[PDB]
Design a protein around this ligand. Structure first.
Ligand SMILES: [N+]
Lengths: 170, 173, 175, 175, 172, 175
């Protein structure tokens, strides 16, 4: 089974979710999942020499307004491998509806005091937004980053996404 | 299920195939699949300080004249992880013979760096030489010897892929 | 199926076992398997700047005193990826109790790296290397308030007996 | 001695120049040389998660129209270490003007990597790779508020002429 | 000339100092400088599988109580290469014993750290990890080190100025 | 000053020598020193996908064959950076010819990595590792049409004898 379907959204939803990582921090290769099997698949090589600034993936058993799993960005000191599960605490949301959750690992004590969007250095939020603003520029795509929402908003959206998945897939 | 059996050979065969990568470029560890489970498995550590010059794996649902999956070499700038699927355009074929053990050479469809690589003449000669030399010498300390009987072009590679897709059906179908 | 349950303990047990690697040498991230799915999972980031000194994982279809799969440490020159199977020759065993639980761990070498062809017993390992591995286990959870006791190292015969015992514990637990 | 002053511009200028590399391909840290000593120095950490797409450095004993050493970008498969000299064949030139000054940069390949033996002019480079390099320079300082315009790429002949100009400009300035 | 002797202590001491890095974050090899030449030298391979948690080096033209240059620890996201100079803002000081204290600093030119100005800006677990590294990394060599705690940015800056003065006394 | 000329051969020659490392284990880029400045320089990219199996460099103030520095190979677990000095204990010597000239190379271990404390002679090295090093030298220039011949390995006593000869020749010939 594709792990997107097999894994639960999290152990204490929405305060703690599972993040199924597709793309380790530092990658220029953009990975996704094969729909039928759930094997890792190369979506594309980014057209610019940019790298993912976060460990990037999806929350299992979620679906969202834009017709795809709900994306999640986990701040990790040492990247994980693709297809690794991280227990993640949502701390905010990037408003790109194609919004993406920002989260920290529960089990890295470095981040113990990161509980809301105000705990993240502004330069780091700017770097993440800039990456999503420009990484597909050479593919003729544009995106506006509207801004960042707080942890409460992120959690509300996670609950919506958990419900949408149950509705679409049963 | 073992992904070698579960995945299709490609989305537009033989122009575009799936390469199931087993070994990232730069690895001295030689990985294969466990037959029953499809888990990555260490076949061996190469006996010499050589590394794979390409991302290396197999085309799903293929079987080749030599009684193994058909091997494919994908030229990647940044290596992928083992068990990653790459949509790949065949551009040629290495005529390795230990005895028909030929291997497809391909480029990723979705790396625009390679957009104009469509045939064997598009590859730098020194790079074809480096790949051939690797396969010529990497098992020398294991007492194996192999001959590289040249490179074939994209048309030849594509024909061989279709033959291997049919071989698999004959064997497992 | 979780590969811990699906994969046999090894091709020629206990002389050659399968090591199902969870943590590559050089990682500070400590990985484990999700019970239901067998996906790789982050257990924790180590609280100190230590890295795993060996490729670390479990022997499939084993269980041990501490209520977990039997752990195995494979000495690899180039680390493997998580969820890679290595055919491993046991050469010794680290006798360690964690919070009062027997939590011994097999030490092994890859059968198919000729560098290790003459490593067959615990006496073939450099003393400083055994010391470094023991020290890692002695101190890696110190900042989590744990204290671990390292008893010493057993030989290849002792390791192999424990592997067979653990294969049997698994059958009792899950059979 | 600062190697930027001590080394010659090249062994056969402008056909073959020395590239003194400051920044390996793959770095997000932007390095420069300390003026007095010639040690490597961190200029900045790029404000965006971008990495240098080329091995990046300077041609010794050059000075360019923007009042700096003339920059050179060497296409390398495996990155070198900072302060490594590469014998480099110029193949083209990136026409950049940033913050309002003419800050063009040579594009070159290593003479001694046979992979690049048939790269001799700008037409030999994949278009997407030229695009990626230009986009990096167009956007890597966006979060610092810096204006940039990439006018396009010149050919090997143009690059070589500019190198000779820069060699002479250094003489004209430093003696 | 050995860069320890050749470089100045910093461009705006003690607010901004130069850190001459010897050991990148992530190294298990412990490097130092050859005294005569200033070439990087392997001091030892750490006896345990620990890696440096910070980019580690010295402040040029300093000397300290224990008869050595004043050590500095710089928090980088991406490690630098040995013999790289970093312009560094001191934010605190690890107290370790003769006094063998070590400055904790952040790079001026990484905006990630713009709001790191004092020891209270550092995650507690990160301070704990650095202290634990120094407490235990020589344990297999028979050494013990008590970590006495962490001082603040003001304390760190005073010690930097004291060390610049001690160098002048030692070397002229 | 070029460190090859400035540094001494070692602190207790020939029992402990200095190895000035040019090429870290794992490199496919072959580095050398610029004669005039002593800066690291790319000699070539190896024509085959092979990497140096050891940390490779030279013993300072030695004169071998045609007046070249004596080469030394240091076995390191974690590679060092180019231009790093390692205190090294010679344990053997690789006897080989390159383009028809004797071009023997010392094999050594780091004094200050306790992993290697009991490595003191050529018999202490796994046979497969000696074979891997020899094979690298046998084949790494094959695509350059270069002819190398590998003769075998000498022991620590022989290695030390050859180091001292090269130290003495430098005393006679340099300058
Ligand atoms: N094979």
């Amino acid at each position: 089974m594709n792990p997107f379907h097999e894994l639960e959204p999290g152990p204490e939803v929405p305060e703690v979710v599972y993040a199924l990582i597709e793309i380790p921090k530092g990658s220029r290769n953009k990975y996704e999942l094969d729909k039928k099997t759930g094997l890792l698949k190369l979506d594309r090589v980014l057209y610019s020499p940019f790298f993912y600034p976060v460990d990037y993936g999806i929350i299992p058993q979620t679906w969202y307004d834009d017709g795809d799993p709900f994306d999640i960005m986990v701040i990790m000191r040492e990247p994980v491998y693709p297809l690794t599960i991280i227990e993640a605490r949502p701390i905010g949301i990037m408003k790109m509806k194609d919004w993406k959750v920002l989260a920290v690992p529960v089990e890295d004590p470095y981040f113990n005091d990161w509980k809301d969007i105000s705990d993240v250095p502004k330069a780091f939020l700017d770097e993440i937004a800039h990456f999503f603003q420009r990484y597909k520029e050479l593919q003729g795509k544009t995106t506006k980053i509207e801004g960042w929402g707080n942890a409460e908003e992120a959690k509300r959206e996670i609950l919506r996404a958990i419900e949408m998945y149950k509705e679409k897939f049963g």
